Amino acid sequence: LGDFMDKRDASIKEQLSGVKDTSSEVKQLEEQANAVMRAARAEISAALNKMKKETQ
Amino acid sequence: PLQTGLIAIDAMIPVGRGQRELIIGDRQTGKTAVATDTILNQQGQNVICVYVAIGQKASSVAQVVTNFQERGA
Amino acid sequence: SVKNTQKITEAMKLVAAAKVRRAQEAVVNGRPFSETLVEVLYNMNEQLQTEDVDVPLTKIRTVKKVALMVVTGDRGLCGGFNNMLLKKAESRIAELKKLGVDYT
Amino acid sequence: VSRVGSAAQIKAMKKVAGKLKLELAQFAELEAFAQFASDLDKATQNQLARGQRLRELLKQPQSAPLTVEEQVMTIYTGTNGYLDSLELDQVRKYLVELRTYVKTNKPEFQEIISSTKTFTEEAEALLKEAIQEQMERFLL
Amino acid sequence: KVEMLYTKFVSLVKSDPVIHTLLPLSPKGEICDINGKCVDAAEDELFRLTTKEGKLTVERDMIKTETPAFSPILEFEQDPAQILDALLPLYLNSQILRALQESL
Amino acid sequence: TIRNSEELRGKAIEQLEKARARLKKVEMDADQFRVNGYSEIEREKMNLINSTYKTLEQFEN
Amino acid sequence: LQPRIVGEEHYEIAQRVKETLQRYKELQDIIAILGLDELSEEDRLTVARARKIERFLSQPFFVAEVFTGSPGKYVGLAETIRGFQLILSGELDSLPEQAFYLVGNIDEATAKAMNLEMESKL
Amino acid sequence: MTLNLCVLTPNRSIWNSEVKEIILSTNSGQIGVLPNHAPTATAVDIGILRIRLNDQWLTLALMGGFARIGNNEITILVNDAERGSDIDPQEAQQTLEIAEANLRKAEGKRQKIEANLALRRARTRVEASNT
Numbered sequence: 081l082g083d084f085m086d087k088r089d090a091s092i093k094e095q096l097s098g099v100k101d102t103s104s105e106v107k108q109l110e111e112q113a114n115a116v117m118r119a120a121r122a123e124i125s126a127a128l129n130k131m132k133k134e135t136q
Numbered sequence: 137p138l139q140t141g142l143i144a145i146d147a148m149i150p151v152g153r154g155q156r157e158l159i160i161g162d163r164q165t166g167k168t169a170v171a172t173d174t175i176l177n178q179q180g181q182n183v184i185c186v187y188v189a190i191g192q193k194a195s196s197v198a199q200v201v202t203n204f205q206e207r208g209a
Numbered sequence: 210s211v212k213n214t215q216k217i218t219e220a221m222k223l224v225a226a227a228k229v230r231r232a233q234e235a236v237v238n239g240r241p242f243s244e245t246l247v248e249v250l251y252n253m254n255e256q257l258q259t260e261d262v263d264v265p266l267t268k269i270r271t272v273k274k275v276a277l278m279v280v281t282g283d284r285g286l287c288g289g290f291n292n293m294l295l296k297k298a299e300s301r302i303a304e305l306k307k308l309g310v311d312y313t
Numbered sequence: 314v315s316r317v318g319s320a321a322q323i324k325a326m327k328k329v330a331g332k333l334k335l336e337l338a339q340f341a342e343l344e345a346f347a348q349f350a351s352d353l354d355k356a357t358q359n360q361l362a363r364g365q366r367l368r369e370l371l372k373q374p375q376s377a378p379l380t381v382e383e384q385v386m387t388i389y390t391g392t393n394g395y396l397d398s399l400e401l402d403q404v405r406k407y408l409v410e411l412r413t414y415v416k417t418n419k420p421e422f423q424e425i426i427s428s429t430k431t432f433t434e435e436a437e438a439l440l441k442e443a444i445q446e447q448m449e450r451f452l453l
Numbered sequence: 454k455v456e457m458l459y460t461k462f463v464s465l466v467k468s469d470p471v472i473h474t475l476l477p478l479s480p481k482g483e484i485c486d487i488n489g490k491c492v493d494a495a496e497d498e499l500f501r502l503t504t505k506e507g508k509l510t511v512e513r514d515m516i517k518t519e520t521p522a523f524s525p526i527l528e529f530e531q532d533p534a535q536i537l538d539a540l541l542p543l544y545l546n547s548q549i550l551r552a553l554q555e556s557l
Numbered sequence: 558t559i560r561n562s563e564e565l566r567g568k569a570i571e572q573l574e575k576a577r578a579r580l581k582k583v584e585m586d587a588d589q590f591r592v593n594g595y596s597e598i599e600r601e602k603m604n605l606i607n608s609t610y611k612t613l614e615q616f617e618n
Numbered sequence: 619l620q621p622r623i624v625g626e627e628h629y630e631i632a633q634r635v636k637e638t639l640q641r642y643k644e645l646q647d648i649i650a651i652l653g654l655d656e657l658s659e660e661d662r663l664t665v666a667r668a669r670k671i672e673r674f675l676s677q678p679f680f681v682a683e684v685f686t687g688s689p690g691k692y693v694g695l696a697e698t699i700r701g702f703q704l705i706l707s708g709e710l711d712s713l714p715e716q717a718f719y720l721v722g723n724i725d726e727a728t729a730k731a732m733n734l735e736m737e738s739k740l
Numbered sequence: 741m742t743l744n745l746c747v748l749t750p751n752r753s754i755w756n757s758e759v760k761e762i763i764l765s766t767n768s769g770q771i772g773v774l775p776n777h778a779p780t781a782t783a784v785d786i787g788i789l790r791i792r793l794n795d796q797w798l799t800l801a802l803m804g805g806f807a808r809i810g811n812n813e814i815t816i817l818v819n820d821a822e823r824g825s826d827i828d829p830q831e832a833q834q835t836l837e838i839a840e841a842n843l844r845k846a847e848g849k850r851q852k853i854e855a856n857l858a859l860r861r862a863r864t865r866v867e868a869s870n871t
């Protein structure tokens with residue numbers, strides 16, 4: 081019965097460390113979306129400045 | 137209408153066919169630029185621009201003539 | 210005349226900026242006093258927060274009257290400063306005359 | 314001053330620039346004595362952030378006039394307020410971006426503005442979609 | 454009751470007169486509100502002058518330093534209630550002095 | 558504590574799958590606009606050569 | 619002095635020198651007279667670089683050799699552009715202020731700065 | 741080794757140096773503090789301080805305060821502080837007779853304090869002006 085108490089709190093703390101882990105992955109994934117999106121716009125801007133200077 | 141190709145003028149102080157618009161301002165303030173913008177905005181319409189430059193500098197009138205010739209005016 | 214008034218107004222602006230610089234040091238000339246005071250006041254209450262302290266400065270008189278000291282300056286020309294102080298003064302004495310507080 | 318200004322001005326510019334003239338007079342009046350009272354008032358702070366931008370969009374380079382559709386579009390986007398969150402340093406780059414975007418991508422707005430000679434709401438809707446597209450393309 | 458109306462250094466652009474209660478004080482080394490909100494969470498003290506441009510502005514510059522711990526066993530003389538009754542007038546004088554200096 | 562931990566892990570891993578979808582698809586829009594803006598700027602280069610050769614011919618006339 | 623007459627980056631260099639000078643002009647009774655209470659970091663960079671530019675602008679003349687002891691040098695357009703491009707964008711802040719005074723080109727100022735540092739080790 | 745003194749006023753700091761031998765009043769009695777003194781908070785009332793460190797004594801006049809003796813630093817926080825060689829002797833006697841004259845109008849709770857304050861204040865002016 082003490083082992084089953086440990087199993088109850090063990091499942092619960094497993095869900096708890098899992099939600100901390102997925103929250104870390106959540107902030108990582110959202111900053112990765114922002115990074116790749118703003119970075120793609122930065123790529124396009126730098127590329128257009130380069131090509132327009134060259135053709136000019 | 138006869139739009140001068142300016143935002144402020146053609147926006148809130150309009151100028152029509154037959155409405156005298158005195159362009160009153162000091163020296164080296166941008167009035168000749170206003171008149172040249174008005175003239176260059178008539179690229180397509182039936183607007184036969186006439187322009188007289190009383191007692192203006194030779195470099196000024198020659199430069200504006202060059203601007204007119206390059207802009208297809 | 211308008212030139213002379215212009216230059217003396219710039220003059221009083223300069224000396225006003227100077228005395229404001231002085232006042233920011235007159236504050237730090239009393240800050241360590243303040244913190245050495247209030248840390249004693251607060252953290253030393255742990256031996257006295259049990260017992261009844263019973264200071265007249267901390268005593269609760271039955272709330273009847275209020276004194277309202279307004280802190281005004283002595284120099285003129287300052288702008289809306291003194292009149293804003295008087296306006297908050299008379300607004301508080303107007304707010305206090307409906308509750309029946311009989312202010313001084 | 315224009316004696317006969319309203320008579321020759323077309324209705325598109327009227328219905329898009331009456332509010333601009335109002336808020337421009339209002340910005341010129343909020344300009345002086347600006348600090349002591351209206352320091353963080355929401356109406357005056359918004360009118361300042363959209364009236365500094367009013368003069369920003371009211372600027373121009375010499376020898377580069379803008380025909381009527383560009384004028385109605387550039388003034389509509391200033392009257393609605395889709396630039397208040399943008400930078401004051403980057404108003405005009407977004408301006409030429411939206412200008413050339415409607416100049417290339419959208420071919421219906423020019424036809425509607427030329428034909429109707431007024432501010433037709435279908436042109437307004439397609440213009441609004443193009444403005445939101447350029448808004449996203451520049452904020453991101 | 455004795456309460457106090459004085460100004461502060463919020464901005465050169467906005468002077469705001471606040472009506473602070475003085476004489477009935479909470480013992481915690483704090484001031485309170487006229488209703489007892491304890492506004493001393495809004496201390497924001499010890500400005501200094503600095504700029505970003507030509508005009509000279511305020512920069513109220515939130516909390517900088519602090520040095521409390523306590524003494525573990527004081528075992529003082531002088532009858533504790535009377536020690537704190539003797540300490541309160543200096544603190545009240547500190548509040549009055551800071552009020553007049555911030556008004557100036 | 559059982560139901561709180563359960564619903565909390567569930568909603569947060571759901572938010573993680575939504576963040577995955579958002580990341581991948583906004584990256585898809587990025588890769589779309591990359592090719593599109595490249596075609597656009599090189600079209601602008603052809604516009605540039607057309608305009609400068611046109612004013613060249615204008616000076617020739 | 620028009621951007622689309624003489625060069626946009628030239629006009630930006632000139633306009634930024636005018637902006638830094640308009641900063642220093644109004645900041646004179648702010649920091650240089652009374653207050654001086656750490657005006658800013660970005661203001662201190664502008665004040666230091668403004669004094670650098672004010673040393674840098676004046677230059678030794680040809681005809682003033684026998685007059686007030688100044689050897690003669692000649693400075694071009696793009697050279698002045700690059701000199702103020704270096705000084706405005708904050709790269710040569712470490713050199714002494716009088717290393718820029720009474721000098722011609724920017725490389726000549728850097729050479730004089732190294733001579734004064736060889737004096738500073740003396 | 742030598743205890744550190746801090747005579748303080750709300751505006752300025754008069755004394756901040758050290759001292760090896762003092763005599764200071766408190767509210768109930770008075771305490772004398774020599775080096776290596778245990779932490780003892782001393783509620784000093786209106787009263788001068790006799791102060792000695794490799795010299796003959798000086799009076800440092802105080803007018804109501806409190807002193808938190810820390811470890812090797814004693815924190816004397818007073819509202820009015822000065823030295824007895826600065827407050828004038830015969831003008832302190834002037835203040836003494838002025839206070840003892842104006843005291844006899846103490847016929848109220850409001851005026852008992854602002855006349856007994858005059859009494860003890862003039863007294864603690866003279867006791868430093870003489871010493």
Ligand SMILES: Nc1ncnc2c1ncn2[C@@H]1O[C@H](COP(=O)(O)OP(=O)(O)OP(=O)(O)O)[C@@H](O)[C@H]1O
Pocket residue numbers: 162163164165166167168169170196373374375376620
């Ligand atoms: N919108 C503008 N953008 C950029 N530069 C401008 C603009 N308007 C005028 N300028 C510049 O200002 C200068 C003066 O313009 P303009 O000649 O129109 O004023 P002016 O009063 O007619 O001068 P003046 O009568 O002394 O010849 C011109 O060199 C022009 O290039």
